[PDB]
Amino acid sequence: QVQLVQSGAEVKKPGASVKVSCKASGYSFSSYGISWVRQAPGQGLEWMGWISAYNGNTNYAQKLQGRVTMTTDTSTSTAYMELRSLRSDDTAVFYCARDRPHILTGFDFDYWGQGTLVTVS
Amino acid sequence: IEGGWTGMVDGWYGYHHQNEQGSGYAADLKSTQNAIDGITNKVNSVIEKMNTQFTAVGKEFNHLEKRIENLNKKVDDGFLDIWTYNAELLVLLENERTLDYHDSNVKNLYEKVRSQLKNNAKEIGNGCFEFYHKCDNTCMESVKNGTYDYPKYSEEAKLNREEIDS
């Protein structure tokens, strides 16, 4: 039913590319969309970005524009976040969530991810 | 453009390509997008800054010289008439603005594709453009994102175009 499996905890140095993965099972992948959010230590940030399995499309957050690249593998029903140019400020706990894939429909965050710690220093 | 696309459920405006690879729909999301933000802001201003429905009038002494409330009665009835008119009219105004806006966005997307393609394609009666050259998915996506390379295909398009007329 509700199976949104994030990737394992990751530790890197500033300026290296990072790649987080979110698996999903059930019939919940009807080419539906997936968005990703940032949570800085102690205080959360706003959304990071979103992507549509139905129509390849990505919306990225501001001032991250230039580092955030997101993908989807429809065959494995998996989404991917990739942040380049890592920062010590970027050190944070990420998260995945459901979303509706075409703009004719709006948004729905019905599921959530196991969480993936990302440390950068 | 005569009709709409039930198959393009990605947004209000977009594309339907049909090449060697096949045929598919895909909405132009920057324009779809600007349209959504615009219509959302329009609706928000209509609803929020609608009017002060609440009768803030204190009516400390109301009217009462005449048996029933006389001045505030007809004042409220007239205010009723005032918006009963303003709201009907505003609905109409903004709805035809929305339809002309959607029409203008469609027109502009079409003109952008036209200015990119120029000679390397032919215009068709309805909304459609027929290439004088082979446009694979890379060429299609190049047209969509606005990076269509005219000199790349200009020679192939020249030869074909000059051939269909014997």
Add this chain to the structure above:
Amino acid sequence: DVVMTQSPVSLPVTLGQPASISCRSSQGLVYIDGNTYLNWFQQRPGQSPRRLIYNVFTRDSGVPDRFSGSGSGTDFTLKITTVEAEDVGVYYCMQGTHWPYTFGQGTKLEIKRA
């Protein structure tokens, strides 16, 4: 851009004393569908968040009748009757209909203010 202000950042609530959380927006959050969009959600320490309210007045299937979501226009509230134990945690506003959508700040709960 949208600004989600939450006035009640800190909330010490005696168990069983209905309290409210206020989200205030810079602009209106209605949409083309006609449905105002803010979906409240709650997070437990070390636990991934889980939503509670859909649009302004729909309760998530997994939400007790205690969690009530209200509001209209730009100012919106969330009141929980007889605040229980697990109800303690961090809360957040939700997407404004404008794509730059803003979670806002956070609001925390306490077991018993006495």
Add this chain to the structure above:
Amino acid sequence: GDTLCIGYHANNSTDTVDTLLEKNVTVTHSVNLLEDKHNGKINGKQPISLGDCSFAGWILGNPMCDDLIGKTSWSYIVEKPNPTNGICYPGTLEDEEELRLKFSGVLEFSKFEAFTSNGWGAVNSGAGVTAACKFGSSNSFFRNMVWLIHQSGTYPVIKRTFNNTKGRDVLIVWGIHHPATLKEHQDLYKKDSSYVAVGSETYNRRFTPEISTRPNVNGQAGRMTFYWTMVKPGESITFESNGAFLAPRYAFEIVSVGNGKLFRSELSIESCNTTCQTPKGAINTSLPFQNIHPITIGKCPKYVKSTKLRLATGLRNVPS
């Protein structure tokens, strides 16, 4: 060759909207701005009914209002449009229409005796009953006031004072008798002219009877002008009179204030109201504007004669 086409979206929604030129335009998407749902006629808070009595009947103590007695708190009082019980002895109520606005702001009162009927001095309190205000077959008078008349051929100057030690606003009511002839004045008050002096911490009035024989209403040619005021906490109001005086006997201590307004319909008591409660009903649907009733309660969408207010959100739906 290959073909790339530009097109818009078509769905199935036929909800139609109307524009400044064309109308019934089938749009792909539209919002209804006009709230026009099923009025649909414990729960939240419970209301009360004034029965065959009016607001005046509900507050003046009209004998037949003995049914009304027993309603201290409410959510939205209900009045019939033409109740049988208003002002049985013909007359008027000074500022009744802002007092009903006051009660649009009152959810509970407590009725208490502010002046004992027999403690007005050597004056007949056991008399002063009329057939116009008869209770059952027997005659009677308003229960919240007492109609004092002479004792043994003399009606002296009487004077009492009330001090609002309750700590809350007290609604007090009285009235002046406007007899039909001079003989009625002499028979009831054993003098030819009288006065009613009402003076509080802020109130100040001297009334005098206006003697003339108005056309008969409920069989009475005389009138009575009833007055009401709000005695604020700490105020000590004093009543002084030597004739033509409808003594206060009961007052109302406003216990709770809120936004419970009133109407004139005959529908069954309806509770569990929504943000806007109307005579027809209270629908949860929250479309910016409504059109069920012009007379509404609570935060309410504006009433509009319209029958359809659908705002176009999508584009012109034309499939195939």
